[PDB]
Amino acid sequence: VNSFSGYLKLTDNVYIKNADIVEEAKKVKPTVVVNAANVYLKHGGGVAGALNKATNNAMQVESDDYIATNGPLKVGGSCVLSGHNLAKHCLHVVGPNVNKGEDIQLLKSAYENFNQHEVLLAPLLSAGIFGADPIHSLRVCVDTVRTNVYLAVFDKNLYDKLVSSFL
Ligand SMILES: Cc1c[nH]c2ncnc(NCC3(O)CCC3)c12
Ligand SMILES: [Cl-]
């Protein structure tokens, strides 16, 4: 039993809700919140910009030190950093950004990072400003993640479309 409330159950391990991941994280304080990161951990917009703003830029400060030490992430890769005031940990996961020409096949590799954590709060990878089809992102999530994932979809119309179209 966990404290995630109001979710619709999609499969044995995948759950979904129309919610702002920022407001959800503040309420639940999950062990792991997933960020929709880029390889430079430049949290300018989309989910990343919103999560960073909620940390008063502390996420960005920590991220800049991480990059200065380790260099950029790989597309499809991840790193674990602090969750600041939002969660214990933030799993920064880089899905492919279609508006950069990146290979959508890397979306499965991106979701595989979730399997290293028993329970996560997360957005759909590569959706929104990363330019992929969110229906596809949900399909890859369900077919790749085996741990317990609570998906927050910010747009109500897209959520209803994701629910109504779910196979
Ligand atoms: C932009 C933003 C702020 N807070 C959020 N919480 C959850 N999801 C988000 N955007 C990603 C999508 O849900 C839309 C396509 C996939 C956001
Ligand atoms: Cl977005």
Decide: 95 in ligand 1 pocket, CB within 6 A. no
Minimum-distance ligand 1 atom for the alpha carbon of 22: 4
CA 153 / ligand 1 centre spacing (Å): 6
Angle (CA) 144-146-149 rounded to 5° is 95
155 alpha carbon, closest ligand: 1
Minimum-distance ligand 1 atom for the alpha carbon of 129: 15
DSSP 100: G
Contact 14, 149 (CB under 8 A): yes
Distance CA 28, CA 96 (A): 28
Question: How was this one solved?
Answer: X-ray
Segments making up each domain of the chain, as ranges? 8-163
Taking CA atoms, 43 is separated from 62, 63, 65, 119, in Å, by: 11, 9, 14, 23
The sheet carrying 119-122 orders its strands as 8-9, 14-18, 148-153, 119-122, 32-36, 89-93, 78-82
Question: Which among 110, 88, 14 has a CA at the least distance from the CA of 80?
Answer: 88
DSSP 124: P
CA 117 / ligand 2 centre spacing (Å): 23
Decide: 46 in ligand 1 pocket, CB within 6 A. yes
The CATH architecture assigned to 8-163 reads 3-Layer(aba) Sandwich (3.40)
Distance CA 105, CA 108 (A): 6
Minimum-distance ligand 1 atom for the alpha carbon of 153: 13
To 10 degrees, the CA torsion angle through 116, 2, 15, 114? Answer: -10
